[PDB]
Amino acid sequence: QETVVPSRVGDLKFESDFPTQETMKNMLNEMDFQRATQAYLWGIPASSIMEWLNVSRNDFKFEEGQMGFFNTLKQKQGIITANFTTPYVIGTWNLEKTGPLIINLPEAKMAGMMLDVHQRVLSDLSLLGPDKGKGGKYLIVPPGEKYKDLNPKGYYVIRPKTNVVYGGIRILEPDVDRVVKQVVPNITTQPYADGKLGRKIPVAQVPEIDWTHIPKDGLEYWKTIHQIIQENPVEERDRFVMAQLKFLGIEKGKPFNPTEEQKKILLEASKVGRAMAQSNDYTKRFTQPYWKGTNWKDAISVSLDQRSENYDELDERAAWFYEAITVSRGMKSTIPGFGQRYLVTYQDSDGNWLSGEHTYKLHVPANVPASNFWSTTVYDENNRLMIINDAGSPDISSRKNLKVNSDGSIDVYYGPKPVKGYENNWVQTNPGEGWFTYFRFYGPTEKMFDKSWTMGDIELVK
């Protein structure tokens, strides 16, 4: 006898209890689809790091294991939600190709970290790191069992659980030009084999070309997921995800040459997945508003090792790493005057999404709870990069700008430019909505304690 069962995915048809042939084909297509779609979210963090490594080796063409200097707007433009204040020193490499690598870090006041491909923190660097700003030598060891017994004396031995690692550093001193010329030249990476040191690799300077490490879309996304899997070992927590991608044509040790049917499912997974990433990130259902009555929320909810008590933070890391890159102890600092804190808002005081054609205003109260500096940077929602405007000015930082008499500071966001507020203006873009992070570099007590707070952005012109 036949029987039909309606469902969210369509009518399920059975013949003599067994599913019909067509229903099985459909279900296996639905299963592969759902699996690919959820894998999309699972892959957000690694996609970012992998795509950065591709740019480094293929576009910038830096030596495998070589660091890069990012400072100018054109250099930083490709970095997801980067700031346009602190000089960056960044590098990504595959430990399997480089072998044990050393990171000779100079004595200076920097903020940084060591990350694995999925962006878990292996160690902070400089001030809030083992060296405490005094400098030191960090040996990064490949997860290969070969190097299991590698523990050389005189180094901060770091052992990532994957091959594709990442290192990032920031110059915190306001005398940018002076410090870079004093610290960067001394920052270097260096091979280490058996018991002999190799040639030191200097920090190269990033070229002036169009680029970005943001996760790609369509099938490009899967090709890179496939790449992530090929360059790294398979970790226990990811064994089921691997099982779920198998029939989509993605497997470790096998080329990615998907069939048409696999492509069709994958294209859909990328589309629906992207929408879900947006949804999970802007909703941020696992956290709450930093300040009641506002849409401001601490942007970083993920743990350093991505471990909660009974689960690994798939959603928390999916949200934060969808719009940003890296995390560290400092980035979640509760130490007065050290590290940084990040608050984000995607809407105005009416809960409406911020769009580049309207005029907005953010009232920054006096005595901002920050020791080094504070800033507001605008990013485009679509790419989550510093919005490219006519002015060539992505943000506003504690610098040369109009300051109210009560010591408050008003920031304006709009297409054109408010009169008298030319120093405190942010040029948006017609119907190209955006958002922004309010950076706290060297956050004090009143920011942690919620003694000092701000309101959401208010709409001005229609």
List contacts with Mg ion (CB under 5 A): 83, 111, 328, 330
328 binds, among a second copy, Mg ion, none (CB under 5 to 8 A by kind): Mg ion
Residue 332 to residues 304, 339, 420, Cα–Cα distance (Å): 9, 7, 36
404 binds, among a second copy, Mg ion, none (CB under 5 to 8 A by kind): none
The Cα–Cα gap between 253 and 227 comes to 10
Helix (H) or strand (E) holding 164: strand 164-171
111 binds, among a second copy, Mg ion, none (CB under 5 to 8 A by kind): Mg ion
- Interface mask (CB under 8 A) for a second copy, residues 212-241, using x and -? ----------------------x-xxxxxx
Q: What token pair was written down for 169?
A: 């550093």
Residue from the set 335, 382, 391, 408 that interacts with a second copy by CB under 8 A: 382
The Cα–Cα gap between 323 and 395 comes to 17
Of 168 and 356, CB closest to a second copy: 356
Residue from the set 335, 353, 392, 450 that interacts with a second copy by CB under 8 A: 353
The Cα–Cα gap between 393 and 417 comes to 12
Q: At a CB cut-off of 8 Å and minimum separation 6, what does 258 contact?
A: 219, 222, 248, 249, 266
| Least Cβ distance, residue 343 to a second copy (angstroms) | 18
Of 180 and 272, CB closest to a second copy: 272
355 binds, among a second copy, Mg ion, none (CB under 5 to 8 A by kind): a second copy
The span of 14-22, 56-64, 74-82, 289-297 binding a second copy (CB under 8 A) equals 14-22
Residues of span 236-295 touching a second copy by CB under 8 A: 236-244, 246-247, 251-253, 268, 271-272, 275-276, 278-280, 282-283, 285
31 is a contact residue toward a second copy (CB under 8 A): yes
Residue bearing tokens 């970005």: 212
Residues of span 414-443 touching a second copy by CB under 8 A: 431-434
Residue 347 DSSP label: B
Residues of span 84-113 touching a second copy by CB under 8 A: none
Of 102 and 378, CB closest to a second copy: 378
Helix/strand/coil for 27: helix
Of 89 and 111, CB closest to Mg ion: 111
Of 100 and 330, CB closest to Mg ion: 330
Of 131 and 380, CB closest to a second copy: 380
Q: Torsion angle of alpha carbons 322, 324, 330, 336, nearest 10°?
A: -110
Of 43 and 129, CB closest to a second copy: 43
- Residue ranges of the alpha helices (H) in 55-171? 73-76, 95-98
Helix/strand/coil for 115: strand
18 binds, among Mg ion, a second copy, none (CB under 5 to 8 A by kind): a second copy
17 is a contact residue toward a second copy (CB under 8 A): yes
User: Among candidates 174, 213, 437, 435, which has minimal Cα distance to 331?
Assistant: 437
Q: What token pair was written down for 127?
A: 């001030």
Max intra-chain CA distance, the chain: 83
| Least Cβ distance, residue 382 to a second copy (angstroms) | 5
| Least Cβ distance, residue 269 to a second copy (angstroms) | 9
The Cα–Cα gap between 333 and 321 comes to 18
